Symmetry: D2
């Protein structure tokens, strides 16, 4: 959609499914070098790369479960290894990984949800940073970091989803620091916060995944979101006002 996205190294966690996939398509279709990601190789990974390669862009697939740090380190290495550097990081990887009411919340479930949603976004962002900071000085422009938020990061988790809500709230926050201490390194930080009961949505609809994806492109584009950093954008249909 945006011209300057042409020829850009874009790393996208959780891009094999849903929103992460939806965006990936748009990034290649703007002529960008996308990195796909998942816990395990999806059946038709190569036929997917064929679509994106044809759209004007280029792609690759690096499997990794980011709940662990070493995995975050390698995912970064292997993407760098193919395209040689990074301009955009899209921390889409995450999820409920279940529902549990408070009394049922134990160490096992807690850690499954915490590391899935937070440690992933942190450690990855850490390993991607000095590469992102490079891309920015190189171009004299600005690299970009985007993470996937939620309405729950404002209002709190749904039924049994307490940790998921607060984990996204954690991310909304931790970016504000990263803006304070790494704006000087030429890296922007921003969040797309998708909003999914139908009576409390003025629109009535739920949100699709191609309803979400453009915000990401907007937030990665220096031309478009040059002076915007440290913001959350809720694509929810009016379920929450932010």
């Amino acid at each position: 959609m945006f011209p300057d996205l042409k020829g850009k190294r874009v790393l996208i966690t959780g891009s094999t499914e849903g929103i992460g996939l939806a965006t990936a398509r748009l990034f290649a279709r703007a002529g960008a070098k996308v990195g796909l990601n998942s816990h395990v190789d999806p059946a038709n990974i190569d036929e997917t790369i064929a679509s994106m390669r044809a759209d004007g862009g280029d792609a690759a697939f690096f499997a990794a479960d980011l709940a662990t740090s070493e995995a975050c380190q390698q995912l970064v290495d292997e993407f760098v290894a193919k395209f040689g550097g990074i301009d955009v990081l899209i921390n889409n990887a995450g999820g409920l990984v279940g529902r549990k009411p408070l009394p049922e919340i134990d160490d096992t479930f807690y850690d499954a949800v915490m590391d899935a949603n937070i440690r992933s976004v942190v450690m990855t962002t850490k390993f991607a940073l000095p590469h992102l900071a490079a891309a920015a000085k190189a171009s004299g422009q600005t690299s970009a970091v985007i993470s996937t938020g939620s309405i729950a990061g404002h209002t709190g988790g749904g039924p049994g989803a307490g940790l998921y809500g607060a984990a996204k709230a954690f991310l909304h926050n931790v970016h504000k620091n990263w803006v304070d201490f790494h704006t000087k390194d030429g890296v922007r930080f921003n969040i797309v916060s998708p909003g999914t009961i139908s009576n409390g949505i003025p629109m009535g609809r739920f949100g699709t995944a191609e309803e979400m994806a453009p915000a990401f492109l907007f937030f990665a584009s220096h031309l478009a979101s040059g002076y915007i950093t440290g913001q959350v954008l809720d694509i929810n249909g009016g379920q929450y006002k932010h």
Copy 2:
């Protein structure tokens, strides 16, 4: 820059200099018909219109002060007369209108700051709504309203700027009420919220993580993004702060 804005009819208030202008010129480059607006025309106007028609869209100036509901009405009637409808509304009109600390606020001041920033926005939107809605029925898509906010609408205004800050805060809130009862009517409401914009100038540029104010040019793309049903079709009720990290909503 966005495709589906070709031939969309766009009214933009206070739109003949700074942000409002930079926004319009770019709205020209998408091929959209735009309503330029000011209290009074500048000499520039014909050039502006020209360059805007050169870039592949269309322009047309309408004079109006929005401190008075009647101007807010007739302004819509004129625009709509010319282009036979509205697809996007941009409430940019507003301003500090001086800087008085609390003690020094009189009624002519209070009215001036309020009428400039709130009354305008409110009434203009009111008159527009049934037209906006109209186009939205036609398209089967969505017309869009976009109001220019401010950082002060979150942090409170600067020296003698209290009423500006609060007036913007007002807009942030009232948009939410409008999201409730007029999403039905097919109109999306959103807010671009600029930070401070171009010894006192220096001291504040220090704190902003990007070590400066924004150029009018950096506030523009957001509006289009908000205008583009393609881009922002399922986004209404939001605020987008373009401030170099000055505040993080």
Copy 3:
């Protein structure tokens, strides 16, 4: 409730009814010199003053409709005239003054709602300021300003109440300035924001007026809210999280 409230000049707009009344009772009952207010003299004003005079405090009644500036100026003068100064201002005066959908919103209704809720809180606060600033230097402590907010100041007006919501949002904001530019004068600013559909309140109940009133006392007390200024406190039962 708080010891230091004993012997304090407290001005309370809209104190003849509901919450403003509820609080007034508590202020006198802590030994304070309260100023009551209304648009027009209420029938049993003097029997009310009898209750408060008996509780350990003292009171008076100054009628005024604060939609106009000159009225705000006199209300301030006449209270000062009786007790000689001000330590606490409680901008409770306000209200919907109707419901109107957007298309029906005209100059007459607009101004009725705007001046009732904003100009009142502004001009009054203006005229009270230098007297409040005096009380603070005198005691070396801090005077206090409190205003009545709403859930609507966060979420937006109810049906036809667009302006009421945004007007309270206006107040939430304008205090943040007053904190910036008059903390030096020894004056604190804070807001009690009462929250009144029963399915979206976790508690189930609506709020009473003696459920609200203590927050005010807490916010006026230097002993209790010495270091707190520029905050909003929602007494809503969990309808909105702030």
Copy 4:
């Protein structure tokens, strides 16, 4: 200071110095039984207990690190064993636990900051809940949980403090989930959020409208206020920032 806190049973974590302490001592002066807590007891402890029993309430120390769910459990069992219930829970335990910029964060650090501030709060509340609820059935009133937040939970943390800021932000949010599904259980959840607390010390005191940090003593009354069903019975889900105007939530 508040009446209806006479004989209420109150657990307070990290409550043997600074804010947590100043809070407890005042909780003594209301005539409430309090659970003092630390990793390890200081020598002070007996004096503290004494002065707290002198002031007309009661004390009792329990050692525990809350980085581990088991300690969070047994700590509740001990307290509840001694005083046969809970009426108020105060999750104060937490801290910076060092200051590392992003690159320098390792897992032993990340775990340390997370376990200290989030895991604790979560689990402790979990174990407490059924007891808190219990007392609430008895009273026909409300037990109360109160978690110590921070300014960084809104503004993001300071140098090397990113994880502290975010952990507090986590608490702000999770309390809302708990308000939904456990108001039923008669427990109110709220947050006192201190700003920074007592050349680097100087430079930040500049911006705070009250030209300083808060004393532990100024953060204390809020907690009681939140504890007192009398005072705060219809308040749950809120945050109270005691920061001299540093941030205005």
